[PDB]
Amino acid sequence: HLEVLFQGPLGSEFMLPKYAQVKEEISSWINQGKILPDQKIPTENELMQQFGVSRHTIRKAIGDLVSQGLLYSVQGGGTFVA
Amino acid sequence: SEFMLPKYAQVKEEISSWINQGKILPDQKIPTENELMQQFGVSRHTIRKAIGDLVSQGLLYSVQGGGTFVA
DNA sequence: TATAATTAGTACGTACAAATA
DNA sequence: ATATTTGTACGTACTAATTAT
């Protein structure tokens, strides 16, 4: 189902960018143990759909989390909790 | 094939080489994204991929509207 | 003092390749 | 061998922060 990236500002103790909201959410899944090490997160398509954002935005978020070391990716395979 | 690298990775290598050879020193600005785009003949996205990786790696840092610098 | 220009940031999109399932 | 999925590369349009006029 659907997750809200809540609609954005230009002046109110600023909201995170959408990619950063996605980062926080996915990170939350890991931290709350909704996803375990070496378990697969949803596909980029699924994430696009459920967060209501572009593939670009999803890849920005996931790329950041991979560089932080709590996700890893395999081309054609998936993205998994580290 | 054995020698092939994606464009963003070749850009990464070159900028890194600038840093490593001390051609660009800490807190000195690297060229703009436009300048890199022109110098390498690639898209702005590819440049940002390169630089983003190098920042994430700690080699560079960026200031929006300011520039990107040797860390 | 205040604008315009420059420059990096965010975010939507397409197209195709490469690796996996 | 097909379909799925992540990777590479590019396009386009703005915004936000800094810099120069």
Swiss-Prot record, chain A:
Per the record, DNA-binding region residues lie at 44-63
Membrane-crossing residues? none
Where in this chain does the record put each HTH gntR-type domain? 15-82
* Subcellular location field: Cytoplasm
Function noted in UniProt = Transcriptional repressor of the arabinose utilization genes. Also regulates its own expression. Binds to two sequences within the promoters of the araABDLMNPQ-abfA operon and the araE gene, and to one sequence in the araR promoter.
Could you identify this protein by its name?
Arabinose metabolism transcriptional repressor
- Relative to the complete UniProt sequence, the shown stretch is 1 to 68 of 362
